[PDB]
Every structure is written in C-alpha cells, then in structure tokens.
C-alpha cells in the first residue's frame, strides 16, 4: 500500500516496532530501501507522537463479525491513542482475513507465545514467581476504526456484517 502510494508523493511514515520481538524493523528497512522518510520508534511512546500524525494505517491479522479486528499486539493502544487524537484508522486487510465469529467467542482470544521472549531464561531465580504474560494478538473494539481498505474498495465497520452473507453462510459460523 505505502510503497506504491509513495512513489508519487513523499511524506511521513512513523513505523512503530512490535516490542515483544521487533517486527516493524524489517518493515522499516524494506520501506527505506526506496527512501520514504521512515521513522522507527518503540511502541511505548505512541500517545506522545500520536498528536503529530494524520492517517493511521494499521496492518491487521484478521477481522471479525463486528469489524472489531484483532491484530499484531499494541494495536489496541494505538487505536485508543489515534481516537484520542481523532485521526482515522485506515485498516488494510484483503477479504480472506475475515472470519464470521464474534469477539468474545475464543477463550484466550489472543495467542500467548513463549514468555522466553519477554524475560529471557538467562535471567535467573526471579523466574520462580513471575507470570510473564505475552499476548501477541490484541483486540481492537468496533467503534475505533473508520475505514476498511478491502480489495473491493473502501468500507465502514457497518458494511462488514453483510460481507459475511455475501461471502459465507449463517450456519458456517461454527464451521
């Protein structure tokens, strides 16, 4: 999306990096390999920089039957920020990232990965009483997004629960 919509213009791309294990960093290298003015930052100061940002393009993992997608971690706090500064949330998800379940259907809706990436084993004794959570998928609510860039065009969080019936069936929710 960006490195095609930025071979005409040149502008500000503030790539946060996923703190559990840096994910946006190869993103930044790949973007900069065309010179797009990419600024990498640690995901803990978004509410600092959010007020000098215009369009919030977030890449998501999958969507739901509310529009309330769940994406790479730290996107829910980015959504709370980018609504506290009322910027748009220009999601970019093709069709096949859309599953007709509902938000509170999965016990541990997230996907906890090995806490070894949050407090590596080489730490020591303090690893005896530390519940080192690591939920690498966070759950955006419905009302924080505004504009799905699906590969049919733009859409809104209330032209999704019909993309179900246009793509799936009612009784394939449980599969």
């Amino acid at each position: 999306f960006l490195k095609e919509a930025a071979r005409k213009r040149k502008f500000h791309v503030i790539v946060a990096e996923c703190a559990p294990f840096c994910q946006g960093h190869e993103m930044a290298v790949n973007l900069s390999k065309a010179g797009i003015e990419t600024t990498v930052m640690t995901d803990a100061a978004i509410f600092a920089v959010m007020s000098r940002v215009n369009k919030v393009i977030i890449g998501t993992k999958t969507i739901l039957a509310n529009g309330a997608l769940r994406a790479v971690t730290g996107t829910h706090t980015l959504a709370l920020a980018a609504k506290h500064h009322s910027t748009p949330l220009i999601v970019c998800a093709p069709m096949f990232k859309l599953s007709p379940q509902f938000p509170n259907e999965e016990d541990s809706f997230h996907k906890f990965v090995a806490p070894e990436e949050v407090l590596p084993f080489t730490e020591g004794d303090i690893l005896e009483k530390v519940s080192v959570h690591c939920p690498v998928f966070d759950y955006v609510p419905p009302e924080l997004i505004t504009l799905f860039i699906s590969n049919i065009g733009g859409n809104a969080p209330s032209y999704i629960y019909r993309l179900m019936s246009e793509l799936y069936h009612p009784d394939d929710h449980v599969l």
């Binding site: 039957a65 509310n66 529009g67 509902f102 509170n104 259907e105 016990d107 419905p142 009302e143 969080p157 209330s158 629960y161 019909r162 009612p170 929710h173």
Partner: protein, 293 residues
Amino acid sequence: MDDKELIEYFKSQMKEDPDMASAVAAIRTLLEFLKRDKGETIQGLRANLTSAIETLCGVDSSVAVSSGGELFLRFISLASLEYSDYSKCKKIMIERGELFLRRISLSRNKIADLCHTFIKDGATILTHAYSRVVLRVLEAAVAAKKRFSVYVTESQPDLSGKKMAKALCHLNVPVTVVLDAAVGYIMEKADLVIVGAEGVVENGGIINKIGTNQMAVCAKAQNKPFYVVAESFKFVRLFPLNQQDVPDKFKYKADEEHPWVDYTAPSLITLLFTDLGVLTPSAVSDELIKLYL
C-alpha cells in the same frame, strides 16, 4: 368476532401462561381470529386484521403487540396467491401464519444457544427487569456450567426486578436486587450488562422499560460493554430521536406523573441479540428493512 371475543380470548391467552411475551400471544390470537374468518376476500381480510391489531393495541400497547401484528401481516401474504377461489388461499395463509408462530417459538432457544458463549467465566451480570429472554439465556448460561453472579434493579413502577430475583434464586444463582437509583454505583463492579429489549427501532437503539437509558449511558461512561437481547418479532418501524419522540401510544400504556418505556441510542449499545444472529445496531437497520421487506 366483534372484537369482544377477541379481547376475552386475548386475556385468556394471557392468564393461561403469563410468562410469554405479549406479542406472541398477539400473533396467536390473530391467527385464531384468522381461522374465525367468515368470509374469503383477501382485502376485507387484511382490513379485518388491521382493525384487529388496532383493537388489540387498545388494551396492551406494549410495542411488542403492534410490532408483532404488523410483522404477521407482512409474512402471511409473502408468496403468491392466485386466489381463483380465495378459500385454498386462506388455507395457505393459516399455514404460513403457523410457520411464523413456529419461528417465534424457536426465537427463545435460538437466543439461548447463540448468546451464552459471551458470558465469560467469573463475571457479574447486570440486568434491569423481568426479561424472560434474559431469564432463559441466563439459564442456558448457568446450565452450561459457567460461573457468575447477578445483580438486578427493582424497576420501581412494577417491581419486576424483585420477581426476577425470586425466579432466579429459584435457579440457585447468587442474585442481589439493588435499588434502581444505584445503577451508577454498581456499574463499576459488574462487568457486562445484559437487558432484554421490548422494541428495536430502525437506527439500532431499543425502547425498553423506564430504567434503561440511564443504565445504557452509565455503562457507556465506565465502559462496561452493553448487550441487549431482542427477538425477531420486536423489530419496530418507529424512529425516535429524543425522549419526546416515542409516541404516547407507546409510552404510558395506562388507558406530575411518570413514563413507562423509553429510548436508548445505538451508540450506547455494543451488540444486539436476535434469532437472526448477533448484530451490531446498524444491522438492525439493514435486516429490518430486509425483514419488513
């Protein structure tokens, strides 16, 4: 059937089993009436059904009754008629109305099997009145071995919350009846608030018992996700915008005082429950224009 047999039969349908929604009784009585035809002319039949709906709402103006009767008229004459004789047609109409009432009977259990996947373990449900839909979904949530507690608000005019508290401790679920004013106090410790609509206008809001608006706006203040259960014979066609925009034919129900039922906007509601599925309150608009056809 000069409308006194109508109302006496409706009261009989009421006291035989008070629990059910007034509207399913309305549809059942309209169907029985339709059987008491005395004449096969499509037009004078639907005019009779509309007069019947009017004389019905004259005693139970709960939005349920009007919504259901109008949906009944909508669904009776769906397929073609070719009324070359007008009597086999009325056979088809009784058949279709019976199918409709079957769908209405399946509403409750569909709600029960779609919803209780949402009360996560160890929560504190909050409700507001004797929403038999909420009672049965709560039963189908507890009997799935979920664990929670439940608060309920007495809803002053008629203390329905107390009756539900009785019929819920009769289900061995920890239940507390808090004052209706205290919906703000408890709103912080109770995770999600379930309540049962009695009318679901086009925008997506609801028209429920008096103590709902304050509950919705509090549970949007302290960000406690809202949920309203509403079956598919309560998709009204109104569209209020304020409190004064629910017609008097819905508010007082009686015939320096108090209203009875009132509005709640589709921003203060997170997810609605119908036997059409789980909807976000815009789906109300779409599926309502598609349901009324």
